[PDB]
Amino acid sequence: SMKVSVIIPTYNERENLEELFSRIDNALQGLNYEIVVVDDDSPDRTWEKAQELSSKYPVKVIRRTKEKGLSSAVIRGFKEASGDVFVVMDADLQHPPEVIPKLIEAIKNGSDIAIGSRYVKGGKVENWPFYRKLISKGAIMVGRIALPKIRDIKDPVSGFFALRKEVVEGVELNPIGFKILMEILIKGKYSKVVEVPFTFGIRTIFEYLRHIYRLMKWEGEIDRIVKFSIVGLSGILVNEGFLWLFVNLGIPKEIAVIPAVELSILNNFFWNDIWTFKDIRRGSIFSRLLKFHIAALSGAVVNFIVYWILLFLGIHYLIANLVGIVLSFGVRYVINRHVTWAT
Numbered sequence: 435s436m437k438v439s440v441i442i443p444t445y446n447e448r449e450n451l452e453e454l455f456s457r458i459d460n461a462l463q464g465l466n467y468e469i470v471v472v473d474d475d476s477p478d479r480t481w482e483k484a485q486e487l488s489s490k491y492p493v494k495v496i497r498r499t500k501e502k503g504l505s506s507a508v509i510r511g512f513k514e515a516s517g518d519v520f521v522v523m524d525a526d527l528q529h530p531p532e533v534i535p536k537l538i539e540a541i542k543n544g545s546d547i548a549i550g551s552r553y554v555k556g557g558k559v560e561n562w563p564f565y566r567k568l569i570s571k572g573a574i575m576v577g578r579i580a581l582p583k584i585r586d587i588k589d590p591v592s593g594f595f596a597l598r599k600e601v602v603e604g605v606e607l608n609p610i611g612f613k614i615l616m617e618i619l620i621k622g623k624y625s626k627v628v629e630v631p632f633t634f635g636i637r638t639i640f641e642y643l644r645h646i647y648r649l650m651k652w653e654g655e656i657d658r659i660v661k662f663s664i665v666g667l668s669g670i671l672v673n674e675g676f677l678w679l680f681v682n683l684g685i686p687k688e689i690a691v692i693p694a695v696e697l698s699i700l701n702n703f704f705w706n707d708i709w710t711f712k713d714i715r716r717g718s719i720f721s722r723l724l725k726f727h728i729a730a731l732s733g734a735v736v737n738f739i740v741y742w743i744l745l746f747l748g749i750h751y752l753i754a755n756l757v758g759i760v761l762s763f764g765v766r767y768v769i770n771r772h773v774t775w776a777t
């Protein structure tokens with residue numbers, strides 16, 4: 435036997451509690467389940483509805499008078515729950531309790547985390563327009579790319595998931611976090627994660643980006659970027675340095691850059707292999723060298739195209755030039771982190 439805590443944070447949720455609880459109990463009938471409801475002193479009748487339903491449903495109601503926030507509510511729920519398996523979902527019925535068996539079965543089969551996912555095969559998000567569905571996936575893309583850990587997670591931003599209690603014991607999760615699932619995906623202890631398709635139902639970006647910056651720092655990814663830029667600086671030295679020498683020994687300036695840029699690449703790869711990424715090196719050292727070349731070149735292409743496009747859009751050459759170097763750097767790092775150094 436296992437005890438299942440369905441944790442549900444609430445603010446102004448009322449006309450949902452009756453049919454929500456109805457559907458949880460039917461889906462979770464027989465299983466030792468508890469419903470933990472954290473309410474941030476909502477002006478809504480609720481909390482008040484929830485303790486009355488504590489007469490007909492196993493419900494433990496938490497009333498926060500001087501704390502607010504979706505992610506902070508879930509943290510508390512983790513503290514107040516005695517089950518072995520946690521389920522987090524929303525009160526507004528956008529998360530269907532009928533897929534909760536499918537979530538817990540996935541935990542039983544050996545997965546530490548089970549995510550109700552909109553975007554895996556089978557998943558749906560009805561009633562949502564295509565441009566709002568794009569920017570969601572896309573924002574998700576930025577996360578999957580910036581955080582290699584969650585690369586394969588197609589819906590890391592779900593508020594609808596399940597997890598084993600051991601994933602969050604003794605872990606400190608940011609209460610200011612935008613989305614709790616990713617705090618768990620980054621700082622949680624686990625081995626397996628699975629996504630479970632569900633159909634999203636009927637009833638900010640700069641906040642999301644600061645979160646990723648926080649997760650990128652915590653994972654040490656900001657460090658990797660810092661140490662990457664330092665390695666690039668050395669390149670500038672070895673590049674210009676061998677250029678001057680080359681030009682002084684007769685070699686024309688137009689033909690001296692060619693070996694000088696290449697010696698800078700070799701320089702930059704070397705320090706990168708044995709410093710920035712010494713922990714995630716793999717395959718041949720010649721094969722990492724080959725890919726690093728593809729990386730430095732990819733950034734050149736990205737720089738060229740972005741430069742010229744901005745020019746056609748009317749942007750100042752010096753501003754188009756700066757954006758084209760920045761984006762070059764970004765792509766060169768991403769391509770290096772994911773491909774050249776594939777963990």
Ligand SMILES: Nc1nc2c(ncn2[C@@H]2O[C@H](COP(=O)(O)OP(=O)(O)O[C@H]3O[C@H](CO)[C@@H](O)[C@H](O)[C@@H]3O)[C@@H](O)[C@H]2O)c(=O)[nH]1
Nearest residue numbers: 443444445447472474502503504507524525526592593594
């Ligand atoms: N204690 C507390 N509870 C909250 C708060 N805000 C929301 N809750 C509860 O969080 C649930 C969802 O809030 P929504 O306002 O409905 O969020 P959404 O934008 O519709 O859903 C999006 O974010 C969710 C969380 O990640 C996702 O589950 C969903 O996919 C979607 O991305 C509701 O049950 C709501 O009562 C809060 O500030 N404090």
Ligand SMILES: [Mg+2]
Nearest residue numbers: 524526528637
């Ligand atoms: Mg909602």
